[PDB]
Amino acid sequence: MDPDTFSYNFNNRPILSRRNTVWLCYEVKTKGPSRPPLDAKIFRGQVYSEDKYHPEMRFLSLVSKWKLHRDQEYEVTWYISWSPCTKCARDMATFLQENTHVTLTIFVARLYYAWDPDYQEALRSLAQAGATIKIMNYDEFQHCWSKFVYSQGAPFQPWDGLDEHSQALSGRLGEILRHS
Numbered sequence: 001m002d003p004d005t006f007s008y009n010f011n012n013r014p015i016l017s018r019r020n021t022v023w024l025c026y027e028v029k030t031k032g033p034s035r036p037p038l039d040a041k042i043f044r045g046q047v048y049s050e051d052k053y054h055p056e057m058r059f060l061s062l063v064s065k066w067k068l069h070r071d072q073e074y075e076v077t078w079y080i081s082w083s084p085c086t087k088c089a090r091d092m093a094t095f096l097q098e099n100t101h102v103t104l105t106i107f108v109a110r111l112y113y114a115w116d117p118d119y120q121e122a123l124r125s126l127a128q129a130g131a132t133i134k135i136m137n138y139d140e141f142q143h144c145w146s147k148f149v150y151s152q153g154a155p156f157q158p159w160d161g162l163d164e165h166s167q168a169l170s171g172r173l174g175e176i177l178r179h180s
């Protein structure tokens with residue numbers, strides 16, 4: 001019941017920050033067909049302390065594990081915030097360039113700017129492979145809320161300016177590559 005892992009890191013207005021010890025939540029679905037009548041094949045998971053590598057190459061084993069159901073293209077959303085997903089982002093373009101028929105939706109939070117002008121540009125190259133890099137949005141939480149939170153399946157809306165914080169961080173994402 002209630003938000004367990006989402007209130008842990010996906011939150012934007014915590015008591016006093018200092019709460020982002022997580023890797024990244026990802027959902028493995030198909031490209032973007034019409035609304036399916038059944039439950040479809042939506043697999044939502046994370047990295048945890050089981051695999052030393054992020055979902056760069058070890059994530060493909062799940063794609064290989066769920067066989068006997070090939071359609072055409074698969075879409076994967078990646079909710080990341082504070083972890084080694086920077087070099088992972090370079091390896092991300094490697095999983096996206098080796099699959100090609102897969103779409104990548106990488107999300108970044110950061111919440112702590114220091115000096116990563118080339119990082120944002122490298123994400124542009126990972127996006128050229130066929131991925132999407134954008135700061136966490138109220139829509140990513142409203143979605144992850146239904147995917148990872150319970151709350152009886154309630155329509156979770158913005159709280160103390162969550163969408164205001166998602167666009168405030170998105171402005172910092174463009175300044176990471178602009179204002180160095």
Ligand SMILES: [Zn+2]
Nearest residue numbers: 054055085088
């Ligand atoms: Zn990663």
